[PDB]
Amino acid sequence: NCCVFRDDFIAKVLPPVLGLEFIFGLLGNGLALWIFCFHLKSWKSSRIFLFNLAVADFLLIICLPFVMDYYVRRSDWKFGDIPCRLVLFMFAMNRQGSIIFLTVVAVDRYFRVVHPHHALNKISNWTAAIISCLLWGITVGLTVHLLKKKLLIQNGTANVCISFSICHTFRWHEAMFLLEFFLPLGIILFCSARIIWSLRQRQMDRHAKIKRAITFIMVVAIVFVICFLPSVVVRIHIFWLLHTSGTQNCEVYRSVDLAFFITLSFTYMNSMLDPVVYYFSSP
Ligand SMILES: C[C@@]1(c2ccccc2)OC(C(=O)O)=CC1=O
């Protein structure tokens, strides 16, 4: 009897917003994959990591119509009782996989400006594919547990495919939702701080085009914070009522859960702005 409910205001927000993001997501990341496969004449180590970033976003954009149909049925999973776990495993894997390949690019850019002579900058394509394959391995390590757990809680006659329910339990999925964001913020922000400082200490900033390069190092951090921070702060807010003054009354959870469910739409926006900021902007 965990806190699960639905409202009508979200039905006037999510179906238009989620559908609109799907149009931009498919045209953006779909076109980006076209250039990588048939227009990139030299596949270096740096472009390999960026390619995986587009694959993760595309695997999430293709699943946007399925989750969109969930709301239009008044929050009812009409079909796919077993695919409910599948359609949710493909969502957390894409979200976490995008973050992992988002920090790697930031880490890769850090080693090219602060340690120009390091041997890591000259790794061959294969070595950049063995590392990339191992990164995909750890993505499913923290996500395949969705299949083991049972899902589709029945509210009498309705079906809801939700794993972010506001119920007082030490769930690994909820805890991993907080580690997937705080830890990269301690690496992405730190790496982007030295890149925007080493390029300034050595006076390379002035009288060069590199001003644009410094600008887009901060743009990446801005997009990451805007897309993921609001979802986290409303998740921690739920934990406050869950730990103290909660677990009994479901009315206090109504406001936060509705905000959390809507704020989750911020996450599928980083999969739309990534081709605009990462690939297309760069020459
Ligand atoms: C909205 C939702 C979803 C996913 C697939 C099918 C229905 C609903 O997306 C997530 C997620 O982004 O991880 C958790 C969900 O409950």
Tell me which long-range contacts 100-105 makes (C-beta under 8 A, separation of at least 24).
100/135, 100/138, 100/139, 101/49, 101/52, 101/53, 101/56, 101/135, 102/53, 102/184, 102/188, 102/224, 103/184, 103/187, 103/188, 104/49, 104/135, 105/49, 105/50, 105/53, 105/278
Q: Which letter does DSSP use for residue 166 in this model?
A: B
Does residue 102 contact residue 53 with C-beta atoms inside 8 Å? yes
CA distance 262 to 100: 24
Q: Which residues contact 57 (CB under 8 A, 6 or more apart)?
A: 25, 29, 94, 98, 271, 272, 274, 275
The reply to whether ligand 1 has any atom less than 6 angstroms from the CB of 272 is no
> Which of 161, 174, 258, 262 has the most ligand 1 atoms within 8 A of CB, as the residue to mutate?
161
The reply to whether ligand 1 has any atom less than 6 angstroms from the CB of 91 is yes
Secondary-structure breakdown of the chain: helix, strand, coil percentages, each rounded to the nearest 5: 70, 5, 25
Does residue 159 contact residue 151 with C-beta atoms inside 8 Å? no
CA distance 139 to 32: 23
CA distance 11 to 167: 23
CA distance 96 to 56: 9
Does residue 76 contact residue 153 with C-beta atoms inside 8 Å? no
C-alpha count within 13 angstroms, C-beta hemisphere, residue 217: 24
The reply to whether ligand 1 has any atom less than 6 angstroms from the CB of 92 is yes
Q: Hey, CA dihedral for 159, 165, 169, 171, is it positive or negative? A: positive
The alpha carbon of 264 and the centre of ligand 1 are apart by a number of angstroms equal to 8
CA angle, residues 38, 43, 45, in degrees to nearest 5: 145
Does residue 94 contact residue 56 with C-beta atoms inside 8 Å? yes
The reply to whether ligand 1 has any atom less than 6 angstroms from the CB of 93 is no
Ligand 1 atom at minimum distance from 161 CA: 7
Ligand 1 atom at minimum distance from 92 CA: 13
C-alpha count within 13 angstroms, C-beta hemisphere, residue 183: 12
Report resolution (Å) to 1 decimal. 3.2
The reply to whether ligand 1 has any atom less than 6 angstroms from the CB of 264 is yes
The alpha carbon of 268 and the centre of ligand 1 are apart by a number of angstroms equal to 10
Ligand 1 atom at minimum distance from 84 CA: 6
The alpha carbon of 108 and the centre of ligand 1 are apart by a number of angstroms equal to 31
Does residue 18 contact residue 64 with C-beta atoms inside 8 Å? yes
The reply to whether ligand 1 has any atom less than 6 angstroms from the CB of 238 is no
Ligand 1 atom at minimum distance from 268 CA: 12
Q: Which residues contact 191 (CB under 8 A, 6 or more apart)?
A: 106, 107, 109, 110
| Sequence ranges of the domains in the chain | 13-277
Q: Whose CA is nearest to atom 16 of ligand 1?
A: 162
CA distance 267 to 180: 12
CA distance 216 to 220: 6
> Which of 18, 67, 98, 99 has the most ligand 1 atoms within 8 A of CB, as the residue to mutate?
67
Distance (Å) of CA 34 to CA 52, 55, 275: 13, 11, 12
Method: cryo-EM
CA distance 148 to 142: 12
CA distance 157 to 164: 20
The reply to whether ligand 1 has any atom less than 6 angstroms from the CB of 161 is yes
